[PDB]
Amino acid sequence: QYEEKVRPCIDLIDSLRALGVEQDLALPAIAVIGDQSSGKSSVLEALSGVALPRRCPLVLKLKKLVNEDKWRGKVSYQDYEIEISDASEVEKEINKAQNAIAGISHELITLEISSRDVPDLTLIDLPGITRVAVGNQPADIGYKIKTLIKKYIQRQETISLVVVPSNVDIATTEALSMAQEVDPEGDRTIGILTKPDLVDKGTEDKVVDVVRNLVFHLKKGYMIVKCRGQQEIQDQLSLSEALQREKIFFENHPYFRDLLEEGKATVPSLAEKLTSELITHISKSLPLLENQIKETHQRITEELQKYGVSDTSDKRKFLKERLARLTQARRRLAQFPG
Amino acid sequence: QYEEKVRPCIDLIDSLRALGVEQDLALPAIAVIGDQSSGKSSVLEALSGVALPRRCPLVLKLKKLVNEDKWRGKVSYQDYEIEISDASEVEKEINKAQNAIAGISHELITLEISSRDVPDLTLIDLPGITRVAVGNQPADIGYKIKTLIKKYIQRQETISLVVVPSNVDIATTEALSMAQEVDPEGDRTIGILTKPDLVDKGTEDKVVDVVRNLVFHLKKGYMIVKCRGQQEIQDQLSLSEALQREKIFFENHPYFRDLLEEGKATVPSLAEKLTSELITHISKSLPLLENQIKETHQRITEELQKYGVSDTSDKRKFLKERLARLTQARRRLAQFPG
């Protein structure tokens, strides 16, 4: 079925997030952030093994099958739950969901994939950061994207996964700037460098220094990947073939082979690191969660007194609904790991 | 000698800036700004035809020789004035100047080149923008660079020349963000896209749209150039040869040849546009300057009254020194165009 040494912790947080308690209770998360055109979408396709579009938070729940061989997919949003036929249908289903529910949206689309080709891993993908409004975006688009990202990354329970093209100085990216703002220590930020084939010749040593953690220091370090480029995406190059191309790319690179040899390159190595980091970050919360729920339930119970334990009726009700959700969270934690 | 139809206006502003009046009196300027690693230094080398390093404002005064054929160079900073032997010595002389005078410095290095290969053009190069401090830079490096840039670009008399690599979304660059902040209209901002050979295959149409002014609109528009890459800089490829490579690059490009045919590509076309824009921007100030000087002299004369017309002695003196400089500016304007 699954590896029941790794799944229970991951499933616990997934189920808590599925309750809707996260607005009120911080939950272990890896949030994927990047400036627009960072290539993070291609990284997400590579990790999930399926094509994706192409906005709002995408919860990617990946589950490693050690058994069936039989790919499974599911997309959930609002009151909808759709079984996905096969891998090729995911992109259509996500577009459908984005259209069904969507300014910048806070509504979650949850994509669950059970596959031999994916890691045990949950990620929260957040929309790419821009500085200036283009086209017909609202003028403060920068602010609205920042607000959504800040909601996740300001919490100590979130690791920021900062995605940056290999050609751009990491100290110039807004995504890293946002990460360093909430995590000055650099204790809960991982860097992923993408598009290494596009690096200007004679500047590869600078990229190596960055991945080796010599430039902007991060406790959890960096990885470098070569996912499908735009042409390959347009040719609908299969994701399995792109993994093969990636491997060859790093094995034959005059500068980046050293990064491969040091465990710092490729999607498969990245997947393994991300699973480990998630498990570590969940483990950090496990001993604390029970008191955290109690604390939160207490505070909200105090707010409930304000309405006296019509507009008053509804205010009472929405607070009761939040308290009920934290009670469900408490019960569900009490069941761990079953 | 020079083209005396174009020089007098350019020389006037140069001479006013050489007086030291700019802290007090806005002067027509084209300020070159970009995020770190934008390739603007290579653009400056291409325009000036000499190798440059490699910080503080570099005033690049370029003067088109229609006569001698005999390359001339001069570097001025503080109380120094150095005659440069030949083109190959410029980089050494600029490094010397940077060391002689230099946090982030506001001191000007003025480089004057008289050459058959340069346009009639003055530019003010400003240090590349970064978001996060690296190495041993002060924590607020972002703020100190912004402050220096803002001093120039907040003035309506400054055109911002925003330099951006062709691979990065222009709406993600800090430099454009700063430009749009002081020039929401986009009436005094020009965009230069660099490194077009590094564009991801299948994304060239997006670059074309940007240069064609279809994405982020600028009244004065965009140009695209292909200057020396890092390897070529390292091989010390001559700047004349790089111009040749550039021409071939655009003539043979499956997407960018259209940009060449539309007058939107290459350093020589860029030089011509920049000369025209500078002349236009100077012409805009010429009718206003006399009243602007009078206004400024008046206001400062009023401040001088505060000290009564030791620390008092010096305060009196520095205000007198500023007033004397504006008087010199008035006299020098009164001489125009001789």
From Swiss-Prot, chains A, B:
Q: Entry's CDD domains? A: DLP_1
- This protein's record includes keyword 4Fe-4S: no
Query: What kind of membrane protein is this, topologically?
Result: Peripheral membrane protein
Q: What is this protein called?
A: Interferon-induced GTP-binding protein Mx1
Instruction: State its location(s).
Output: Cytoplasm; Endoplasmic reticulum membrane; Cytoplasm, Perinuclear region
Q: Which family does it belong to?
A: Belongs to the TRAFAC class dynamin-like GTPase superfamily. Dynamin/Fzo/YdjA family.
Q: Where in this protein does the record put region G1 motif?
A: 34-41
Q: Which residues form the Dynamin-type G domain?
A: 24-287
**Quaternary structure and interacting proteins, as annotated:** Homotetramer. Oligomerizes into multimeric filamentous or ring-like structures by virtue of its stalk domain. Oligomerization is critical for GTPase activity, protein stability, and recognition of viral target structures. Interacts with TRPC1, TRPC3, TRPC4, TRPC5, TRPC6 and TRPC7. Interacts with HSPA5. Interacts with DDX39A and DDX39B. Interacts with TUBB/TUBB5. The GTP-bound form interacts (via C-terminus) with THOV P5 protein. The GTP-bound form interacts with LACV protein N. Interacts with CCHFV protein N.
Q: What induces or represses expression of this protein, per its UniProt record?
A: By type I and type III interferons. Isoform 2 is induced by HSV-1.
